[PDB]
């Protein structure tokens, strides 16, 4: 069995290997990349996402989210407080202000220490989940707005035609902005490209060990767990690497830099934080290997998780027994 210790693998495809996205995902899995839950893909030196980032300041962040924490430094939840709209230019200025800018630090490890020590005492503002793309239409390779859709994959594998569309999302980040522990909707893959700016640190649990994370989370967030049997779908809970080590949960960590792709694999729990002002783009996708994960994915039916239009058909076709309860949670 390839990659039996579930280490995060890093790939350096040639320009030729960068042509066929599906084939390269399948190649990565042949080498055991999916066992980690997360892989890094460094694009060939010939490739570019677009010509420059000089003209992005007028993009609107309609609902910036202030991420307010509660709990202790290693074990906390966050809620999202809606702020007034601002442009990417206004946001970048705010990120770089004394109140929100990255502190002086020696290296990524020092910054990680500072994040886990001090995150709870600040409430950074995140521009998340903005529908859109920064890939040039003329970028033909690994263009996140031109991937095959999850609806077409399900149709190709299973023969059922379904409604729904699948488009990318932009994330504008600042120091301490945080993504809580989660797997993707319906345990899909995700792909994330860091277009510009400061890094993003990721933590990941191997898919084969996801249930160990869930058990710990139920222990650490006992009221949340009573409220919903899939409360990690709410995307609000954080657990530090120190706490995971203390409880024997297998995980790995890696820092993504501008110009790099990360791929999360089905049922790979991940979490992380941004180092400073940045812009990422991400989208879900599927492969044939996903179908079995989709069929077994947990669902939140308590009402909190509320998700896209397009998840309806996935639940309806893959999880017909669950569909009625899940939809009640939607309404
Ligand atoms: O970049 C972020 O804030 C969150 N991204 C993801 O969880 C992802 O790409 O799967
Ligand atoms: Mg603009
Ligand atoms: Ni994700
Ligand atoms: Zn729930």
């Amino acid at each position: 069995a390839q990659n039996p210790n579930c280490n995060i693998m890093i790939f350096h495809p040639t320009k030729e290997e960068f042509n066929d996205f599906d084939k390269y995902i399948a190649y990565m899995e042949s080498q055991g990349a999916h066992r980690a839950g997360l892989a890094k893909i460094i694009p060939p030196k010939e490739w570019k996402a677009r010509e420059t980032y000089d003209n992005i300041s007028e993009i609107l962040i309609a609902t910036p989210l202030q991420q307010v924490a509660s709990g202790r430094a290693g074990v906390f939840t966050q809620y999202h407080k809606k702020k007034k709209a601002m442009t990417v230019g206004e946001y970048r200025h705010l990120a770089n202000s004394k109140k929100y800018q990255t502190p002086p630090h020696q290296n990524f490890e020092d910054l990680e220490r500072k994040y886990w020590k001090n995150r709870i005492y600040n409430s950074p503002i995140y521009g998340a989940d903005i529908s859109g793309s920064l890939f040039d239409e003329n970028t033909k390779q690994w263009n996140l707005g031109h991937l095959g859709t999850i609806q077409d994959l399900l149709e190709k594998e299973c023969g059922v035609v379904i409604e729904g569309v699948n488009t990318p999302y932009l994330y504008f980040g600042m120091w301490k902005t945080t993504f809580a522990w989660h797997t993707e909707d319906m345990d899909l893959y995700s792909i994330n490209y860091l277009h510009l700016g400061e890094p993003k640190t990721w933590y990941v649990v191997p898919p084969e060990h996801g249930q160990r994370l869930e058990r710990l989370a139920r222990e650490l967030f006992p009221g949340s767990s009573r409220g919903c049997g899939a409360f990690l779908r709410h995307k609000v809970a954080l657990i530090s690497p120190t706490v995971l080590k203390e409880n024997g949960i297998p995980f790995n960590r890696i820092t993504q830099e501008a110009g790099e792709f990360m791929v999360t694999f089905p049922y790979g729990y991940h979490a992380g934080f941004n180092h400073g002002f940045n812009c990422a783009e991400a989208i879900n996708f599927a492969t044939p290997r996903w179908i079995d994960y989709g069929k077994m994915a947990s669902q939140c039916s308590c009402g909190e998780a509320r998700v896209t239009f397009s998840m309806d058909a996935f639940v309806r076709i893959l999880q017909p027994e669950r569909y009625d309860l899940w939809k009640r949670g939607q309404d």
Side-chain angles (χ1 to χ4, degrees), residues 18-32:
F18 220 47
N19 285 325
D20 185 334
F21 181 85
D22 286 352
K23 180 181 193 180
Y24 203 81
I25 300 302
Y27 170 68
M28 296 160 57
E29 296 183 345
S30 79
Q31 308 301 293

Side-chain angles (χ1 to χ4, degrees), residues 75-81 83-214 216-244 246-305 307-327:
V75 182
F76 63 92
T77 59
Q78 55 188 12
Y79 89 85
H80 291 166
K81 183 176 173 157
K83 305 296 282 187
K84 293 199 150 131
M86 77 181 70
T87 64
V88 163
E90 291 164 338
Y91 182 89
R92 175 172 66 232
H93 195 261
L94 185 67
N96 292 336
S97 70
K98 293 186 186 180
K99 182 175 181 66
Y100 289 112
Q101 70 187 206
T102 315
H105 56 288
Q106 297 298 345
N107 50 49
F108 293 167
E109 179 174 345
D110 186 30
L111 192 69
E112 183 189 37
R113 186 190 60 66
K114 288 171 186 296
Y115 173 83
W116 291 103
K117 183 181 163 55
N118 294 316
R119 156 74 183 92
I120 63 171
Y121 301 110
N122 300 88
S123 300
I125 296 164
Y126 205 3
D129 295 315
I130 297 158
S131 294
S133 188
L134 291 173
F135 282 89
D136 190 310
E137 64 178 9
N138 297 321
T139 300
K140 297 318 186 192
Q141 299 169 317
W142 287 56
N143 182 321
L144 299 190
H146 296 163
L147 300 184
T149 70
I150 299 157
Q151 300 73 21
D152 285 344
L153 183 283
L154 179 151
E155 177 185 333
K156 284 181 300 186
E157 295 302 296
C158 298
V160 65
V161 177
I162 50 169
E163 73 290 352
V165 290
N166 178 200
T167 56
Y169 295 90
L170 300 180
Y171 299 80
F172 291 93
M174 71 170 59
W175 171 237
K176 283 170 177 176
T177 54
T178 303
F179 51 112
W181 280 103
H182 68 283
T183 60
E184 306 302 308
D185 290 344
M186 217 69 185
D187 299 343
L188 290 154
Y189 296 70
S190 68
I191 183 164
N192 183 300
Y193 182 68
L194 191 53
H195 278 283
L196 63 95
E198 305 314 308
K200 188 187 300 283
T201 293
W202 302 66
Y203 303 92
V204 58
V205 175
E208 66 201 72
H209 301 305
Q211 294 87 351
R212 301 184 183 219
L213 186 71
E214 292 175 351
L216 180 65
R218 291 192 300 275
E219 295 164 1
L220 297 176
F221 302 98
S224 300
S225 179
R226 286 184 290 270
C228 179
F231 73 94
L232 299 173
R233 299 277 171 213
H234 310 164
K235 309 195 294 180
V236 299
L238 279 299
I239 305 161
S240 73
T242 295
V243 179
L244 293 178
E246 288 172 340
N247 290 277
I249 310 301
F251 75 95
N252 280 303
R253 70 194 88 192
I254 195 170
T255 301
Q256 175 192 24
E257 298 187 76
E260 307 179 336
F261 289 93
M262 305 298 300
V263 164
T264 80
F265 294 86
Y267 197 60
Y269 273 101
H270 53 283
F273 63 92
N274 292 306
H275 289 208
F277 174 68
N278 63 17
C279 174
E281 179 168 341
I283 194 173
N284 301 114
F285 73 92
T287 68
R289 196 173 69 77
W290 166 71
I291 295 284
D292 285 345
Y293 288 88
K295 293 176 173 163
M296 302 183 297
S298 70
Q299 302 301 348
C300 166
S301 308
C302 79
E304 284 304 308
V307 300
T308 183
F309 183 113
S310 311
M311 232 187 91
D312 197 279
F314 304 153
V315 182
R316 197 171 71 245
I317 299 308
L318 296 182
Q319 305 182 309
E321 188 268 330
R322 287 172 172 182
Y323 181 61
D324 281 353
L325 181 69
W326 171 78
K327 199 164 32 64

